[PDB]
Design an enzyme around this catalytic site. Structure first.
Site, PDB file in Angstrom:
ATOM      1  N   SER A 131     118.609  36.639  88.891  1.00 38.45           N
ATOM      2  CA  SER A 131     118.879  36.919  90.291  1.00 38.45           C
ATOM      3  C   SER A 131     118.298  35.825  91.183  1.00 38.45           C
ATOM      4  O   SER A 131     117.256  35.228  90.891  1.00 38.45           O
ATOM      5  CB  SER A 131     118.306  38.288  90.686  1.00 38.45           C
ATOM      6  OG  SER A 131     118.410  38.504  92.087  1.00 38.45           O
ATOM      7  N   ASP A 136     124.743  52.479  76.855  1.00 41.16           N
ATOM      8  CA  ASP A 136     123.472  51.784  77.047  1.00 41.16           C
ATOM      9  C   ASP A 136     123.655  50.289  76.805  1.00 41.16           C
ATOM     10  O   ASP A 136     123.706  49.857  75.650  1.00 41.16           O
ATOM     11  CB  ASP A 136     122.413  52.372  76.122  1.00 41.16           C
ATOM     12  CG  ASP A 136     121.060  51.690  76.266  1.00 41.16           C
ATOM     13  OD1 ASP A 136     120.875  50.889  77.203  1.00 41.16           O
ATOM     14  OD2 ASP A 136     120.173  51.991  75.443  1.00 41.16           O
TER      15      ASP A 136
HETATM   16  N1  LIG Z   1     118.029  50.970  77.635  1.00 43.04           N
HETATM   17  C1  LIG Z   1     117.702  50.187  76.454  1.00 43.04           C
HETATM   18  C2  LIG Z   1     116.386  49.419  76.605  1.00 43.04           C
HETATM   19  C3  LIG Z   1     115.174  50.082  76.738  1.00 43.04           C
HETATM   20  C4  LIG Z   1     113.993  49.361  76.867  1.00 43.04           C
HETATM   21  C5  LIG Z   1     114.033  47.975  76.868  1.00 43.04           C
HETATM   22  C6  LIG Z   1     112.760  47.142  76.997  1.00 43.04           C
HETATM   23  F1  LIG Z   1     111.710  47.937  77.361  1.00 43.04           F
HETATM   24  F2  LIG Z   1     112.495  46.560  75.785  1.00 43.04           F
HETATM   25  F3  LIG Z   1     112.963  46.166  77.933  1.00 43.04           F
HETATM   26  C7  LIG Z   1     115.243  47.318  76.734  1.00 43.04           C
HETATM   27  C8  LIG Z   1     116.418  48.038  76.605  1.00 43.04           C
END
Ligand SMILES: NCc1ccc(C(F)(F)F)cc1
EC number: 3.4.23.22
Length: 330
Positions: free
Chosen positions: A199, A35
């Site tokens: 982007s 992630d």
């Molecule tokens: N996959 C991790 C993640 C999930 C949600 C967000 C948000 F909603 F804060 F942009 C950022 C990062």
């Protein structure tokens, strides 16, 4: 040194990708979701509430000779979809695809939200954003990438996600056989702790390219593409019978329609997302309404280049002192 690991979609829609990770001595192999939008390595464990575990593989620190409780340390995290988890913290040895880090913070989940419990394929998360987002208190902990950086040949990792197919996460080197043409690098802002970039515009199908700056994050942990309402409206306007549905929670379209491609800009380069990548299938079994892979970010407050976008490219996460993001066609 270097590492290389295969990553596999968890289902037929590519909702998430799991990558095997070795934790402990002797190795306990867990399938983690890599992630780049978070910075915590957390796992289901022997400490997770028994009713909150449904088929996951669990890390058992008592069976690891290298596990050490990080005394007093706790973690609590909440994701943008409402998911959450929390527990205590061990240090242990962690290996990805041959790359080994000793003393990595392994956050043992004592409580997990219902989203994780009902997903038996995902044993945990491996965060690859910047360490400033790590939730360990009172001593913040470093990500796997940060701890491995010094021993890597180059301080990079690459994401090569597959469309309905396995892919590769590489650490420390750039596979020049995995892409076509040149890699286009663009600057990253670390100010929020994300792989945040800008982007240069977009196009819908064979339409004209609209030069406009879209700030967003490169997030392997997010399934869909979340863009501003103006862009998402211009895309779905080209799909016969598409509409935003309040009961479903986003744009849906007749499953019989064919979807146009979506092009996004990386400096002067273009990445094309084939229309088939934007189809996420019926909203319920047997329904003739299908769910769209491009949705509005207005509710979220940040634009997210999730898996829908990233799997159309070979993506370099360059973690040099001045970080950059590299994109190539493949
Ligand atoms: N996959 C991790 C993640 C999930 C949600 C967000 C948000 F909603 F804060 F942009 C950022 C990062």
């Amino acid at each position: 040194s270097t590492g290389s690991a295969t990553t596999t979609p968890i289902d037929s829609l590519d909702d998430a990708y799991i990558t095997p990770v070795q934790i402990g001595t002797p190795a306990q192999t867990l399938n983690l979701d890599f992630d780049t939008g978070s910075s915590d390595l957390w796992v289901f464990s022997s400490e997770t509430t028994a009713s909150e575990v449904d088929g996951q593989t669990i890390y058992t620190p008592s069976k690891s000779t290298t596990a050490k409780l990080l005394s007093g340390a706790t973690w609590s995290i909440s994701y943008g979809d409402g998911s959450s988890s929390s527990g205590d913290v061990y240090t242990d040895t962690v290996s990805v695809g041959g790359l080994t880090v000793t003393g990595q913070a392994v956050e043992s989940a004592k409580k997990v939200s219902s989203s994780f419990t009902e997903d038996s394929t995902i044993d945990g998360l491996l965060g690859l954003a910047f360490s400033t987002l790590n939730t360990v208190s009172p001593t913040q902990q470093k990500t796997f990438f940060d701890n491995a950086k010094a021993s890597l040949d180059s301080p990079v990792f690459t994401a090569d996600l597959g469309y309905h197919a396995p892919g590769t996460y590489n650490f420390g080197f750039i596979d020049t056989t995995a892409y076509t043409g040149s890699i286009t690098y663009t600057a990253v802002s670390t100010k929020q702790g994300f792989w945040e970039w800008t982007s240069t515009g977009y196009a819908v199908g064979s339409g004209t390219f609209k030069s406009t700056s879209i700030d967003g994050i490169a997030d392997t942990g997010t399934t869909l593409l979340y863009l501003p309402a103006t862009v998402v409206s211009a895309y779905w306007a080209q799909v016969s019978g598409a509409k935003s549905s309040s009961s479903v929670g986003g744009y849906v379209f007749p499953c019989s329609a064919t979807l146009p491609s979506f092009t996004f800009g990386v400096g002067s380069a273009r990445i094309v997302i084939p229309g088939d990548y934007i189809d996420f299938g019926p909203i319920s079994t047997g329904s003739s309404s299908c769910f769209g892979g491009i949705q509005s970010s207005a509710g979220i407050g940040i634009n997210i280049f999730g898996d829908v976008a990233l799997k159309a490219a070979f993506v370099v996460f360059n973690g040099a002192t001045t970080p950059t993001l590299g994109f190539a066609s493949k």
